[PDB]
Design a protein around this ligand. Structure first.
Ligand SMILES: COC1=C(OC)C(=O)C(C/C=C(\C)CCC=C(C)C)=C(C)C1=O
Lengths: 51, 423, 446, 54, 49, 54, 105, 57, 146
């Protein structure tokens, strides 16, 4: 029941918190990449493919 | 090289409602609805109702809810505020000129659509306690309240602040009834700055055609005289001493107005000896510590109080008071120079012109002029009337204070405060 | 009818002239029957030194107590007897003597102000009298908790600098300060380049000049050349002063980050953001429904008795924040909400509230410039601080530019992850530790 | 109670091998469980609102 | 008389760039936060390892 | 005054199982909460006494 | 005016009797889920309606405890059932939805 | 010359939506912080004097 | 104070005295609210010293013997050196104090200066009191004699 949250202000405020939320997935994935040593991804990275 | 000014435009509707506007071409607009509904219109069964009413100006109306008034106004940087004297309430609204429409609608909803809901009203009654508390921390607030309580028996005796016993007790019916009885056409004046008289008139003829409370500015205030005393320990004794003066409007009232300036009202010069203040100079001659004296002058539709207001240390209280009172007595005996009277005139006149300089000030003058006089009365003609005061009338004003049954209020350590009786 | 836009254009040119002096002489004609004239000196207390300090105040105290031409008592006599109002203030940067008078009295109004600002007969008798008076003021000023905390916040933020000083100075200076000290300050600082004759009301500019030349003839005429210095820049600390006194019934806190000061375009935008946070007082009508999220929560949860945002400007610096007053168990919650507000506005200012703040600011501004005295004060001060009067339309332009981005930007620049100055007074057990306050100055989510 | 009985139904099916009726009835009870909870009960609730004028 | 209060002199504890009473602290502000956050950045970097 | 109300530990017990306002009114279907509890420790006790030999 | 809207009414009167809050002297508005919107409207109820409401619920929870029901005489007749809360509840939601539109701009 | 108000005597209260409650007219408060130790009620279960909606650029 | 001041009469007779006298008998039997929390040990000490002296005391005993009383008095109650006079001397002044309640019943007392206790005139008033009528004698009576 979320009709409440649809208006000009809400879209301004989402548009505000977008670059931040972008970077937070950058943080979260790259951390998971590093913590699991994801192989599949890390081959792409120069220096870090230590094989 | 500014605009050659517009004139005020002033209109009496046949229902007795009064409209005045000025188009100053100002970026802001002020609107006041000035009602004959001040505190003198409470009776002993509903004391305080006009003070709750003073606070209730953003409670829900018929088609403008509480939330909307607050947000609607705040959204435009508007203000809405309500000011009572013993005679009038004055609902005034301010904003940028493009926004008069939204503000006017809010204003009329408050003064003509108050719903007064049980639960909103109940939520508000603690605020009389806070509001009273804040106001009653100037010793003068109490004094002038007791001063009125002691002078009159009735009407002007009533306090601008709700009695403590009524806090929590004033009802929605009592509120409703107060609006019905008092906020009618014959009793109102709609004044607008930075609005046009056609619009005001439309608004008035549309929305402010209300009538069927009562007529009279009139229980008629019975002066009685007396004294109220309040033991404080505040270390400084405040005291006011007073006789019945003249009703506002009358020629005699300007005699008192000028006599006020002879004896001396506030300071003019920051940290000055008040060389021109007779009361200050007479009291100083006797008295060698911190004090203040000023001539006190209140004037109402159907009475007024004149005298003076002292602040002294507890032990000097009497010395100050007796010094002050003599100094009046000395003018009654006829010791009054024409350049003294002239000085007080320039003091009064300039003070008047000064007082109407700003929008807030001008609007207030015009509002109250409308309700007390049914007119507007330009500076040129106010100063004229001021000039019209005879040296003799001022003597006689002072004669009247001296010879007239008195009223006193004082609070502090009263051990050396006199008793009327003892003056 | 007139639009508000139109209505701003209608407000007249502030007319400026310069004397053969340094003395600028400025005026806004209106159709008033009444005026405010006076002198804005670029003296203050940033300008004094540790030994000097509280001189200007001692001068203000002496200023109306009699000249070479009009001895002790008699200036009063003249002002009062013509129904005029004589008045003064000093700030950390500004001294102002002004008269409210009848417009027909602008001659003798100027004549007087001239006599005051040059020919101050600083009679020994009086400097002695004044020292007891000025001490009493210090004793009573100690009771205004608000007056105190702002002196403390100044004392800690500017910690090291002349700006850290009070306007009245310390007890000891007041008792030791001599006539020599005073005339030295007077002759250093009351020079024509560092003062403006300002007037507003019912007068032609031409008369104002005629009178400027007549009575301000030769102030810095042959003068000036030796040892006038410019102000030093003032280091902001950010730092805390906690003066704990549980005998007092409510706590005053005043928190601030460093402002850019008078000149800076950022003042407009900050003032908007400030306006959005606004102010509260327990006598405010209608509480829960206030626009401001601070003021709303404050009122609903009875979290204080008062708050106020501020932006005090000095040359090249200033104090930007808020001050409040509350119960001993509110100091934390009040701190939380104020800080979280600042941060919301730094990160996620929506479009709508900024239009509110913009309007609130416009309304403040027009409403502020109401009648001779405000407008005169704004003429005088402005010429000191901007070198112009900035016309109302220009402010509207400067306001209109600002929107949500201009807020989040200009807020983040001043507020985000910045060391505040805190001053605190009274029952302040629960005033958040400085680290924890400074932690409040950024969000981890952002 | 349709839900309870249906769950009893699924307990009982769980208890029989993956052969003839057992398969289809089991698929049906599976659909019924997710129907009752996801679609049938919210609608039934709403109808009683409209029944009480609510 | 609350006007008798000076804040004690602090130079004895002050970082080098925050010492000139005449020098704005805004210049050194970025560096000082830079150093101390790099001190915490590297710690996390070490703990993460 | 009552030790049961103010002693830091007994406090917790009293607020949960002594002075706690329950409805006048709840029925047998409410007994399962506690019996779940009684189940958890009965499983802990036998489970322990079993672990001594397993 | 109508045979059929007397039938929707008969369906409604059925469901009413069938629900059987009546059976414990309850009214439909006694039975409402307390959320914030509801909670406030109880706040807004005048003294008597509030005191009557608390008694109805008190009587019912008592019966519910003793697993009993009123005499059929003493049950709440469908027609005799006053939606004493309705207008308050509506006014609350009305006020909330305003705040909600304002929060959108 | 009406408005009783600033006939500088009797009391006028102001309430507001935006702005702190006022108490009005005249009497010594005044030539009275001049000879001194008027100690002042300055922020005890309280309002605030001066009051705002009075800022600048 | 709170307990006592819940008989409307307590207030009245307190205000009645406050209004009659300027001084002395004007003072209230109950502490002013502004003094609650403010009366000191010195003020207490001084009150005893000023007022609890020999010239000011009377030691009365029932079911005790006069020799013992006298011994106790001559041993323990030989105190003097406050003040003499039963005397500021109470200045009658007259006036009125009014207190808006809403109590639905108005209590009011109206009074003039009578006679000092002891004097012959005071017994005239004592008797006049009984002519006009004091309390009831007969439970739920019309007070035929009042
Ligand atoms: C009114 O509601 C409640 C009940 O009546 C329906 C209970 O009977 C119990 C009893 C709880 C027990 C015996 C706890 C056992 C669990 C553990 C983890 C030790 C509680 C707390 C309760 O709140």
């Amino acid at each position: 029941m979320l009709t409440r949250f649809l208006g000009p202000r809400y879209r301004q405020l989402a548009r505000n918190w977008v670059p931040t939320a972008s970077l937070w997935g950058a943080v979260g994935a790259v951390g998971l990449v590093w913590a699991t040593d994801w192989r599949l991804i890390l081959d792409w990275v120069p220096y870090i493919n230590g094989k | 090289v500014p605009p050659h000014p517009q004139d005020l435009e002033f209109t009496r509707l046949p229902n007795g409602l009064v409209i005045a506007s000025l188009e100053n071409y100002a970026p802001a607009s002020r609107i006041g609805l000035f009602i004959k509904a001040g505190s003198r219109y409470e009776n002993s069964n509903n004391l305080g109702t006009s003070h709750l009413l003073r606070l209730a100006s953003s409670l829900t109306t018929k088609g403008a809810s509480s939330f909307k008034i607050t947000r609607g106004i705040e959204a435009v940087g508007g203000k809405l505020s309500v000011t009572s004297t013993r005679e009038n309430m004055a609902y005034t609204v301010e904003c940028l000129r493009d926004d008069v429409d939204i503000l006017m609608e809010f204003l009329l909803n408050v003064t003509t659509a108050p719903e007064f809901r049980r639960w909103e009203v109940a939520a508000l009654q603690p605020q009389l306690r806070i509001d009273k508390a804040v106001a009653l921390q100037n010793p003068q607030a109490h004094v002038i309240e007791n001063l009125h309580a002691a002078a009159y028996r009735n009407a002007l005796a009533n306090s601008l602040y709700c009695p403590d016993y009524r806090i929590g007790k004033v009802t929605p019916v009592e509120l409703h009834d107060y609006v019905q009885n008092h906020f009618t056409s014959a009793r109102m004046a709609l004044i607008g700055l930075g609005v046009s008289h056609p619009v005001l008139k439309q608004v008035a003829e549309q929305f402010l055609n209300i009538r069927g409370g009562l007529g009279l500015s009139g229980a008629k205030a019975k002066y009685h005289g007396g004294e109220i005393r309040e033991q404080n320990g505040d270390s400084l004794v405040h005291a006011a001493l007073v006789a019945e003066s003249a009703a506002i409007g009358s020629a005699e009232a300007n005699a008192f107005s000028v006599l006020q300036h002879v004896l001396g009202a506030g300071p003019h010069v920051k940290r000055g000896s008040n060389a021109t203040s007779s009361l200050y100079q007479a009291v100083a001659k006797g008295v060698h510590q911190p004090f203040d004296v000023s001539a006190f002058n209140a004037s109402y539709s159907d009475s007024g109080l004149f005298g003076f207001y002292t602040i002294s240390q507890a032990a000097s209280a009497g010395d100050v008071i007796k010094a002050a009172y003599n100094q009046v007595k000395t003018i009654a005996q006829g010791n009054l120079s024409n350049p003294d009277v002239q000085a007080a005139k320039n003091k009064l006149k300039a003070g008047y012109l000064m007082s109407v300089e700003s929008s807030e000030g001008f609007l207030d003058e015009v509002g109250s002029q409308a309700l007390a006089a049914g007119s507007y009365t330009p500076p040129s003609t106010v100063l004229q009337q001021i000039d019209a005061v005879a040296d003799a009338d001022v003597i006689n004003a002072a004669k009247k204070f001296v010879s007239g049954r008195k009223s006193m209020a004082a609070s502090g350590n009263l051990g050396h405060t006199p008793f009327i009786d003892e003056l | 009818t007139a639009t508000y836009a139109q209505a701003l254009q209608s407000v007249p040119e502030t007319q400026v002239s310069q004397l053969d002096n340094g003395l600028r002489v400025a005026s806004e004609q209106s159709s008033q029957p009444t005026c405010t004239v006076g002198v804005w000196i670029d003296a203050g207390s940033r300008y004094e030194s540790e030994k000097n300090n509280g001189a200007g105040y001692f001068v203000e105290h002496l200023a109306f107590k009699g000249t070479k031409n009009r001895p002790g008592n008699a200036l009063e006599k003249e002002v009062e007897s013509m129904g005029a109002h004589l008045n003064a203030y000093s700030t950390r940067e500004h001294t102002a003597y002004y008269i409210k008078a009848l417009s027909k009295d602008l001659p003798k109004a100027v004549e007087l102000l001239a006599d005051i600002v040059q020919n101050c007969s600083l009679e020994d008798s009086q400097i002695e009298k004044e020292r007891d008076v000025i001490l009493q003021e210090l004793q009573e000023n100690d009771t205004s908790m608000r007056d105190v905390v702002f002196n403390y916040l100044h004392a800690t933020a500017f910690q090291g600098t002349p700006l850290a000083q009070s306007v009245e100075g310390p007890s000891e200076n007041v008792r030791k300060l001599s006539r020599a000290d005073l005339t030295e300050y007077l002759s250093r600082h009351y020079k024509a380049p560092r003062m403006v004759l300002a007037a507003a009301g019912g007068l032609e500019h031409r008369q104002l000049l005629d009178l400027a030349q007549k009575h301000f003839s030769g102030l810095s005429g042959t003068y000036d050349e030796d040892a006038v210095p410019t102000l030093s820049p003032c280091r902001f600390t950010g730092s805390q002063i906690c003066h704990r006194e549980d005998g007092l019934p409510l706590a005053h806190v005043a928190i601030a980050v460093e402002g850019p000061g008078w000149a800076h375009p950022d003042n407009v935008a900050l003032q908007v953001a400030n306006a959005i946070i606004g102010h509260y007082d327990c006598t405010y009508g209608g509480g829960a429904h206030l626009s401001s999220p601070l003021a709303s929560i404050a009122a609903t949860n009875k979290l204080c008795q008062s708050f106020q945002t501020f932006n005090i400007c000095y040359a090249d610096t200033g104090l930007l924040g808020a001050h409040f007053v509350c119960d001993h168990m509110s100091i934390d919650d009040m701190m939380f909400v104020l800080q979280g507000q600042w941060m919301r506005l730094c990160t996620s200012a929506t479009e709508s509230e900024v239009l509110r703040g913009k309007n609130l600011l416009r309304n403040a501004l027009v409403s502020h410039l109401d009648g001779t005295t405000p407008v005169c004060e704004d003429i005088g001060r402005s010429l000191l601080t901007y070198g112009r009067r900035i016309p109302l339309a220009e402010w509207e332009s400067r306001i209109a530019e600002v929107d949500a981005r201009v807020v989040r930007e200009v807020c983040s620049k001043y507020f985000y992850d910045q060391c505040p100055a805190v001053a605190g007074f009274g029952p302040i057990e629960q005033l958040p530790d400085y680290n924890r306050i400074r932690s409040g100055m950024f969000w981890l989510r952002f | 109670w349709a839900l309870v009985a249906d769950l009893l139904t699924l307990t009982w099916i769980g208890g029989q091998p993956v052969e003839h009726p057992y398969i289809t009835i089991g698929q049906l009870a599976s659909v019924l469980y997710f129907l009752l909870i996801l679609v049938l009960m919210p609608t039934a609730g709403t109808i009683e609102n409209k029944l009480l004028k609510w | 008389s609350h006007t008798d209060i000076k804040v004690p002199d602090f130079s004895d504890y002050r970082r080098p760039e925050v010492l000139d009473s005449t020098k704005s602290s805004k210049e050194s502000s970025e560096a000082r936060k830079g150093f101390s956050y790099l001190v915490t950045a590297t710690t996390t970097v070490g703990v993460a390892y | 005054t009552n030790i049961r109300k103010s002693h830091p530990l007994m406090k917790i017990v009293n607020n949960a199982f002594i002075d706690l306002p329950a409805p006048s009114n709840i029925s047998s279907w409410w007994n399962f909460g506690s019996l779940l509890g009684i189940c958890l420790i009965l499983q802990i006790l036998t489970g322990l006494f079993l672990a001594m030999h397993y | 005016v109508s045979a059929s809207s007397r039938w929707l009414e008969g369906i409604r009167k059925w469901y009413y009797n069938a629900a059987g809050f009546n059976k414990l002297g309850l009214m439909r508005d006694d039975t409402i889920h307390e959320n914030d919107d509801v909670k406030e409207a109880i706040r807004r109820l005048p003294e008597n309606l509030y005191d009557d409401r608390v008694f109805r619920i008190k009587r019912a929870l008592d019966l519910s405890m003793r697993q009993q029901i009123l005499p059929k005489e003493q049950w709440t007749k469908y027609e005799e059932d006053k939606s004493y809360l309705e207008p308050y509840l509506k006014e609350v939601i009305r006020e909330r939805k305003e705040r909600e539109e304002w929060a959108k701009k | 010359m009406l408005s009783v108000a600033a006939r500088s005597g009797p009391f006028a209260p102001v309430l507001s939506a935006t702005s702190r409650g006022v108490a009005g007219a005249l009497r010594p408060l005044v030539q009275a912080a001049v000879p001194a130790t008027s100690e002042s009620p300055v922020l005890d279960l309280k309002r605030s004097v001066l009051c705002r909606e009075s800022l600048r650029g």
